[PDB]
Tab-separated table of C-alpha atoms and ligand atoms in Angstrom:
chain	number	residue	atom	x	y	z
A	1	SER	CA	7.513	6.888	-21.010
A	2	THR	CA	7.952	7.375	-17.257
A	3	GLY	CA	6.078	8.968	-14.408
A	4	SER	CA	7.172	10.259	-10.992
A	5	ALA	CA	4.813	11.411	-8.213
A	6	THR	CA	5.329	12.389	-4.605
A	7	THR	CA	3.459	10.401	-1.956
A	8	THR	CA	2.647	12.074	1.371
A	9	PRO	CA	1.665	10.521	4.723
A	10	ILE	CA	-1.944	11.492	5.594
A	11	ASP	CA	-1.193	11.993	9.303
A	12	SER	CA	1.591	12.108	11.893
A	13	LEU	CA	1.646	8.301	12.245
A	14	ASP	CA	2.069	7.428	8.532
A	15	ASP	CA	-1.221	5.487	8.655
A	16	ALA	CA	-1.437	5.767	4.851
A	17	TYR	CA	0.076	7.710	1.993
A	18	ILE	CA	-1.702	9.767	-0.676
A	19	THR	CA	-0.521	10.527	-4.172
A	20	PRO	CA	-2.130	13.090	-6.500
A	21	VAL	CA	-3.738	11.603	-9.618
A	22	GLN	CA	-5.197	13.527	-12.578
A	23	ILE	CA	-8.479	12.065	-13.904
A	24	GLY	CA	-10.459	13.334	-16.870
A	25	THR	CA	-10.399	16.331	-19.194
A	26	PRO	CA	-9.933	18.972	-17.929
A	27	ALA	CA	-7.989	17.270	-15.159
A	28	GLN	CA	-9.645	16.559	-11.848
A	29	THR	CA	-6.913	15.945	-9.274
A	30	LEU	CA	-7.764	13.432	-6.539
A	31	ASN	CA	-5.459	12.157	-3.802
A	32	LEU	CA	-5.425	8.350	-3.975
A	33	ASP	CA	-3.999	5.646	-1.752
A	34	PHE	CA	-1.680	3.552	-3.974
A	35	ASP	CA	-2.279	-0.018	-2.869
A	36	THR	CA	-0.006	-2.871	-4.050
A	37	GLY	CA	-2.387	-5.285	-2.254
A	38	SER	CA	-5.462	-4.596	-4.439
A	39	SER	CA	-6.322	-4.088	-8.070
A	40	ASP	CA	-9.181	-1.553	-8.339
A	41	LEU	CA	-8.812	2.181	-9.063
A	42	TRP	CA	-11.890	3.599	-7.360
A	43	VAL	CA	-12.819	7.115	-6.394
A	44	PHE	CA	-15.292	9.107	-4.386
A	45	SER	CA	-17.557	10.670	-7.016
A	46	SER	CA	-20.649	12.719	-7.852
A	47	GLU	CA	-22.470	9.329	-7.564
A	48	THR	CA	-21.356	8.634	-3.984
A	49	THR	CA	-24.277	8.652	-1.485
A	50	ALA	CA	-24.179	12.246	-0.110
A	51	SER	CA	-24.168	11.009	3.588
A	52	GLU	CA	-21.043	8.766	3.037
A	53	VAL	CA	-18.922	11.767	1.833
A	54	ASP	CA	-17.194	14.000	4.446
A	55	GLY	CA	-14.593	16.385	2.912
A	56	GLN	CA	-13.208	14.175	0.104
A	57	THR	CA	-12.582	15.544	-3.322
A	58	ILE	CA	-14.941	13.850	-5.797
A	59	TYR	CA	-14.615	12.815	-9.412
A	60	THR	CA	-17.520	14.169	-11.542
A	61	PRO	CA	-17.558	12.189	-14.820
A	62	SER	CA	-20.189	14.490	-16.371
A	63	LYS	CA	-17.542	17.316	-16.278
A	64	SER	CA	-14.937	15.209	-18.152
A	65	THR	CA	-15.065	15.314	-21.942
A	66	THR	CA	-13.142	12.000	-22.094
A	67	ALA	CA	-15.293	10.067	-19.566
A	68	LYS	CA	-17.379	7.142	-21.005
A	69	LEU	CA	-19.747	4.944	-18.938
A	70	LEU	CA	-18.536	1.352	-19.138
A	71	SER	CA	-22.061	0.039	-19.747
A	72	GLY	CA	-23.254	-2.659	-17.403
A	73	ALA	CA	-20.053	-2.795	-15.357
A	74	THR	CA	-20.183	-2.822	-11.562
A	75	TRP	CA	-17.648	-3.357	-8.832
A	76	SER	CA	-17.615	-4.220	-5.154
A	77	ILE	CA	-14.592	-4.694	-2.919
A	78	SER	CA	-13.909	-5.671	0.704
A	79	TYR	CA	-10.461	-5.113	2.223
A	80	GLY	CA	-8.589	-7.195	4.833
A	81	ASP	CA	-9.406	-4.490	7.474
A	82	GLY	CA	-13.203	-5.012	6.949
A	83	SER	CA	-13.772	-1.770	4.892
A	84	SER	CA	-15.660	-1.745	1.556
A	85	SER	CA	-16.909	0.194	-1.401
A	86	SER	CA	-18.924	-0.430	-4.545
A	87	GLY	CA	-20.348	1.297	-7.604
A	88	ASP	CA	-20.262	1.581	-11.374
A	89	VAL	CA	-17.455	2.203	-13.868
A	90	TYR	CA	-16.264	4.848	-16.339
A	91	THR	CA	-13.287	4.826	-18.627
A	92	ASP	CA	-11.257	8.061	-18.669
A	93	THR	CA	-7.756	9.416	-19.031
A	94	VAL	CA	-5.678	8.993	-15.874
A	95	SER	CA	-2.230	10.534	-15.309
A	96	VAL	CA	0.205	9.918	-12.482
A	97	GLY	CA	3.335	12.049	-12.239
A	98	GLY	CA	3.258	12.858	-15.976
A	99	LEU	CA	2.516	9.267	-17.150
A	100	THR	CA	-0.862	9.128	-18.965
A	101	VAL	CA	-3.125	6.141	-19.637
A	102	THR	CA	-6.162	6.524	-21.873
A	103	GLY	CA	-9.192	4.330	-21.381
A	104	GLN	CA	-8.373	3.491	-17.753
A	105	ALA	CA	-11.260	1.983	-15.772
A	106	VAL	CA	-12.179	4.507	-13.069
A	107	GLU	CA	-14.527	2.795	-10.617
A	108	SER	CA	-16.999	5.395	-9.302
A	109	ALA	CA	-18.211	4.729	-5.752
A	110	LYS	CA	-21.928	4.733	-5.078
A	111	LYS	CA	-21.365	3.386	-1.549
A	112	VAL	CA	-18.346	3.323	0.850
A	113	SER	CA	-17.967	1.892	4.389
A	114	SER	CA	-17.596	4.135	7.457
A	115	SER	CA	-13.733	3.893	7.595
A	116	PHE	CA	-13.556	5.512	4.118
A	117	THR	CA	-16.124	8.248	4.981
A	118	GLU	CA	-14.193	9.097	8.182
A	119	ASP	CA	-10.833	9.451	6.297
A	120	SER	CA	-11.321	12.928	4.670
A	121	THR	CA	-7.757	12.799	3.218
A	122	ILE	CA	-8.218	9.732	0.948
A	123	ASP	CA	-10.242	10.335	-2.222
A	124	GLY	CA	-9.983	6.694	-3.378
A	125	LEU	CA	-7.526	3.882	-4.062
A	126	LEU	CA	-5.269	3.062	-6.972
A	127	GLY	CA	-4.606	-0.680	-7.006
A	128	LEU	CA	-1.186	-1.993	-8.079
A	129	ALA	CA	-1.571	-5.728	-7.401
A	130	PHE	CA	-2.147	-8.088	-10.354
A	131	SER	CA	-5.205	-7.454	-12.545
A	132	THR	CA	-6.556	-10.962	-11.732
A	133	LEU	CA	-7.840	-9.400	-8.429
A	134	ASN	CA	-9.794	-6.588	-10.114
A	135	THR	CA	-13.459	-6.763	-9.009
A	136	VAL	CA	-15.189	-5.269	-12.072
A	137	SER	CA	-18.028	-7.472	-13.388
A	138	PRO	CA	-18.812	-8.804	-15.900
A	139	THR	CA	-15.599	-7.768	-17.671
A	140	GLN	CA	-12.565	-7.619	-15.357
A	141	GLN	CA	-10.448	-4.468	-15.862
A	142	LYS	CA	-6.721	-3.782	-15.832
A	143	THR	CA	-4.744	-1.776	-13.283
A	144	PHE	CA	-3.144	1.529	-14.188
A	145	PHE	CA	0.251	-0.232	-14.166
A	146	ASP	CA	-0.909	-3.035	-16.444
A	147	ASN	CA	-2.368	-0.491	-18.906
A	148	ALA	CA	0.823	1.663	-18.781
A	149	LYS	CA	3.317	-1.215	-18.932
A	150	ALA	CA	3.838	-1.523	-22.704
A	151	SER	CA	4.472	2.301	-22.937
A	152	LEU	CA	7.011	2.389	-20.056
A	153	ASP	CA	10.768	2.542	-20.608
A	154	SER	CA	11.085	-0.504	-18.225
A	155	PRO	CA	8.030	-2.546	-16.985
A	156	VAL	CA	8.549	-1.502	-13.361
A	157	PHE	CA	7.316	0.780	-10.657
A	158	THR	CA	9.069	1.645	-7.424
A	159	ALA	CA	7.850	2.586	-3.960
A	160	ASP	CA	10.012	4.859	-1.832
A	161	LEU	CA	7.859	5.621	1.195
A	162	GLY	CA	9.037	8.144	3.777
A	163	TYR	CA	9.123	7.854	7.571
A	164	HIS	CA	7.138	10.846	8.774
A	165	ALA	CA	8.018	12.502	5.442
A	166	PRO	CA	7.044	12.475	1.770
A	167	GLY	CA	8.357	9.835	-0.610
A	168	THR	CA	8.021	8.856	-4.240
A	169	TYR	CA	6.280	6.444	-6.602
A	170	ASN	CA	8.109	6.107	-9.941
A	171	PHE	CA	6.852	4.301	-13.013
A	172	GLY	CA	9.087	3.027	-15.816
A	173	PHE	CA	12.545	3.578	-14.333
A	174	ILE	CA	14.702	2.874	-11.297
A	175	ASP	CA	16.197	6.057	-9.721
A	176	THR	CA	19.711	4.843	-8.868
A	177	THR	CA	20.176	7.919	-6.619
A	178	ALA	CA	17.263	6.938	-4.351
A	179	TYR	CA	18.936	3.965	-2.548
A	180	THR	CA	22.275	2.861	-1.111
A	181	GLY	CA	24.210	-0.265	-2.037
A	182	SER	CA	22.597	-2.724	-4.452
A	183	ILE	CA	19.023	-3.928	-5.060
A	184	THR	CA	18.416	-7.579	-4.125
A	185	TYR	CA	15.744	-9.200	-6.228
A	186	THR	CA	13.581	-12.097	-5.055
A	187	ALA	CA	10.986	-14.356	-6.672
A	188	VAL	CA	7.284	-13.520	-6.764
A	189	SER	CA	4.308	-15.829	-6.888
A	190	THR	CA	1.261	-14.316	-8.623
A	191	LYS	CA	-0.984	-17.304	-7.702
A	192	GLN	CA	-3.035	-15.253	-5.170
A	193	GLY	CA	-2.877	-12.034	-7.276
A	194	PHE	CA	-0.399	-10.346	-4.874
A	195	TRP	CA	3.250	-9.369	-4.913
A	196	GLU	CA	3.910	-12.504	-2.807
A	197	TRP	CA	7.471	-13.380	-1.907
A	198	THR	CA	9.483	-15.280	0.733
A	199	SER	CA	11.674	-13.499	3.227
A	200	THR	CA	14.738	-15.467	4.369
A	201	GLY	CA	14.359	-14.619	8.096
A	202	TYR	CA	14.601	-11.997	10.745
A	203	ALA	CA	16.502	-10.513	13.655
A	204	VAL	CA	15.313	-8.518	16.642
A	205	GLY	CA	17.543	-5.570	17.595
A	206	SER	CA	21.222	-6.576	17.768
A	207	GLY	CA	20.212	-10.282	18.081
A	208	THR	CA	21.348	-13.090	15.827
A	209	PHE	CA	19.581	-13.533	12.513
A	210	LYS	CA	17.113	-16.467	12.415
A	211	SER	CA	17.082	-18.157	8.986
A	212	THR	CA	13.465	-19.105	8.318
A	213	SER	CA	11.167	-18.795	5.270
A	214	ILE	CA	8.345	-16.244	5.745
A	215	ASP	CA	5.955	-16.077	2.811
A	216	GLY	CA	4.108	-12.771	2.618
A	217	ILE	CA	2.964	-9.911	0.421
A	218	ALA	CA	4.421	-6.495	-0.270
A	219	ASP	CA	1.397	-4.270	0.444
A	220	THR	CA	1.666	-0.486	0.385
A	221	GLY	CA	-1.998	-0.183	1.355
A	222	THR	CA	-1.493	-1.911	4.747
A	223	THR	CA	-0.080	0.277	7.538
A	224	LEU	CA	1.644	-2.340	9.722
A	225	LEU	CA	3.924	-5.372	9.478
A	226	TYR	CA	1.941	-8.625	10.116
A	227	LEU	CA	4.115	-11.694	10.745
A	228	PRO	CA	3.723	-15.123	12.317
A	229	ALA	CA	2.945	-15.216	16.024
A	230	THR	CA	6.306	-16.841	16.877
A	231	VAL	CA	8.235	-13.950	15.210
A	232	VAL	CA	6.023	-11.247	16.732
A	233	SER	CA	6.268	-12.775	20.235
A	234	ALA	CA	10.081	-12.838	19.893
A	235	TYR	CA	10.101	-9.141	18.963
A	236	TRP	CA	7.808	-7.877	21.761
A	237	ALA	CA	9.573	-10.054	24.398
A	238	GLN	CA	12.475	-7.595	24.001
A	239	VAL	CA	10.274	-4.618	25.105
A	240	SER	CA	9.688	-4.336	28.888
A	241	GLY	CA	5.978	-4.205	29.640
A	242	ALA	CA	4.794	-5.093	26.097
A	243	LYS	CA	1.805	-7.400	25.924
A	244	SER	CA	-0.857	-8.617	23.539
A	245	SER	CA	-4.151	-6.917	24.455
A	246	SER	CA	-7.384	-8.636	23.266
A	247	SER	CA	-9.255	-5.410	24.325
A	248	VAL	CA	-7.092	-3.156	22.077
A	249	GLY	CA	-6.610	-5.724	19.287
A	250	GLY	CA	-2.857	-6.378	19.284
A	251	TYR	CA	0.456	-5.785	20.962
A	252	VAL	CA	0.789	-2.619	23.013
A	253	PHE	CA	3.803	-1.286	24.834
A	254	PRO	CA	4.657	1.484	27.317
A	255	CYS	CA	5.005	4.781	25.555
A	256	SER	CA	8.163	5.315	27.699
A	257	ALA	CA	9.925	2.390	25.890
A	258	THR	CA	12.726	2.608	23.393
A	259	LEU	CA	11.877	-0.030	20.722
A	260	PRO	CA	14.470	-2.329	19.153
A	261	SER	CA	14.942	-2.499	15.427
A	262	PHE	CA	13.607	-5.368	13.356
A	263	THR	CA	15.578	-6.863	10.448
A	264	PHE	CA	14.069	-8.922	7.649
A	265	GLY	CA	15.934	-10.967	5.052
A	266	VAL	CA	15.734	-10.562	1.290
A	267	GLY	CA	17.869	-13.347	-0.057
A	268	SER	CA	21.309	-12.851	1.555
A	269	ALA	CA	20.530	-9.126	2.051
A	270	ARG	CA	19.004	-7.501	5.142
A	271	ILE	CA	16.563	-4.580	5.552
A	272	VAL	CA	16.640	-2.929	8.966
A	273	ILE	CA	13.441	-1.288	10.292
A	274	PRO	CA	14.479	1.231	12.967
A	275	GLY	CA	12.661	0.907	16.280
A	276	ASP	CA	11.000	4.287	15.887
A	277	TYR	CA	9.183	3.020	12.756
A	278	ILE	CA	7.384	0.445	14.968
A	279	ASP	CA	5.781	3.133	17.237
A	280	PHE	CA	2.205	3.925	16.345
A	281	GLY	CA	1.593	6.142	19.362
A	282	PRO	CA	-0.993	6.179	22.135
A	283	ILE	CA	-3.877	3.742	21.768
A	284	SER	CA	-6.263	6.599	22.624
A	285	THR	CA	-5.584	10.181	23.026
A	286	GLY	CA	-3.444	10.876	26.175
A	287	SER	CA	-2.851	7.182	26.953
A	288	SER	CA	0.573	5.959	28.081
A	289	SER	CA	-0.075	2.632	26.249
A	290	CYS	CA	1.233	2.736	22.675
A	291	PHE	CA	0.237	0.562	19.730
A	292	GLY	CA	2.861	-1.607	18.099
A	293	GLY	CA	3.748	-1.589	14.445
A	294	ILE	CA	4.544	-5.316	14.283
A	295	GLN	CA	1.466	-7.475	14.857
A	296	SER	CA	0.526	-11.120	14.446
A	297	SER	CA	-0.849	-12.336	11.142
A	298	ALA	CA	-2.299	-15.490	12.746
A	299	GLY	CA	-5.960	-14.215	12.335
A	300	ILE	CA	-5.396	-13.011	8.647
A	301	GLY	CA	-4.226	-16.124	6.723
A	302	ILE	CA	-1.252	-14.266	5.127
A	303	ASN	CA	1.822	-12.351	6.283
A	304	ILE	CA	1.854	-8.728	5.172
A	305	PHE	CA	4.923	-6.566	4.638
A	306	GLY	CA	3.011	-3.306	4.956
A	307	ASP	CA	4.264	0.253	5.185
A	308	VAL	CA	6.266	-0.292	8.407
A	309	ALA	CA	8.517	-2.651	6.461
A	310	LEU	CA	8.375	-1.089	3.009
A	311	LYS	CA	9.264	2.459	4.133
A	312	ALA	CA	12.602	1.092	5.430
A	313	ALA	CA	13.503	0.168	1.817
A	314	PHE	CA	13.513	1.256	-1.793
A	315	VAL	CA	11.186	-1.324	-3.336
A	316	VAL	CA	11.089	-2.366	-6.996
A	317	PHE	CA	7.919	-3.942	-8.319
A	318	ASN	CA	9.222	-5.629	-11.482
A	319	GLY	CA	6.314	-6.413	-13.834
A	320	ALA	CA	8.385	-8.231	-16.465
A	321	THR	CA	6.949	-11.459	-17.961
A	322	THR	CA	8.213	-13.216	-14.812
A	323	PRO	CA	7.590	-10.649	-12.039
A	324	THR	CA	10.115	-10.134	-9.237
A	325	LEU	CA	10.502	-7.793	-6.210
A	326	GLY	CA	13.650	-5.848	-5.437
A	327	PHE	CA	14.694	-4.330	-2.095
A	328	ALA	CA	17.512	-1.892	-1.351
A	329	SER	CA	18.455	-0.045	1.806
A	330	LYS	CA	18.243	3.762	1.603
B	1	R97	C1	-5.842	3.194	11.075
B	1	R97	C2	-5.855	3.658	9.653
B	1	R97	C3	-5.007	3.271	8.675
B	1	R97	S1	-5.372	3.959	7.298
B	1	R97	C4	-6.648	4.774	7.980
B	1	R97	C5	-7.511	5.703	7.176
B	1	R97	C6	-8.652	4.977	6.496
B	1	R97	C7	-8.967	3.660	6.800
B	1	R97	C8	-9.989	3.044	6.097
B	1	R97	C9	-10.661	3.743	5.124
B	1	R97	C10	-10.300	5.051	4.901
B	1	R97	N1	-9.319	5.677	5.570
B	1	R97	N2	-6.827	4.546	9.246
B	2	NA	NA1	-5.479	1.085	14.697
């Protein structure tokens, strides 16, 4: 089997991407944030505290003939950005782009933090990291990918995120029309439950490539590119008037600037992030100070190749017995 679904940026900045997901019988279609940095499929629901819902579409398990309470199971998650949610668990049929899993754990939110409430466009998350990070207690649950894997034509999914445009998540096949050149594969460590890999270095604009190992994760659920302070300082030094602002919480730059590109290494291959991808617009409405898309990881404890980086590539998440990542230009 395969599946193919379109993913759409929620706003004009590409802060996140939503993908329609069918849950239950008859189908209830919710727009979920596919997150390769977490491992829970959770949804706003008929159980969510009424005051923490503002415009989301909810899952109502009592209207699904295939929904079953997973008795005793609870979940609770905190993300790197400080947000959180928690609740109880159903199993139900879940389909993505024509690929169907029966008995998927669908984590029903009773509570969500303010950042979720205030994002009317995201109806929940679909985690695509390794199932060792799943938060369900007392019986940890599998991701949608892990449950689908045995059925797929090839134990893979791919992320093809758009810049200010829709893109695609495919499951079970690699669309050889969706990228240019060849795919370079690189080793993955699953020791922290992430798609963790080591970039071979970077360049800023038309500068020389610096060969240096940068361990980090491929995370579709993180907006920005978080890298070591040395790398980030080298990038923003090439933008007149850029500075790190403690008040704003990162590097800002004059909205009048033209940003340089940023290149990252994947083995001997190179992925180029155009400068425009690194513009996240005014820090507040009408400001002439713009927020940068490359930020320091120094206060995180891990480097994160988030959407800024991933949308410059066609990315293969290879879930074979020994997982690997692949990157191609596009
Ligand atoms: C700055 C940003 C990135 S994604 C997003 C939307 C969001 C964040 C947290 C919870 C729910 N929705 N805002
Ligand atoms: Na922000």
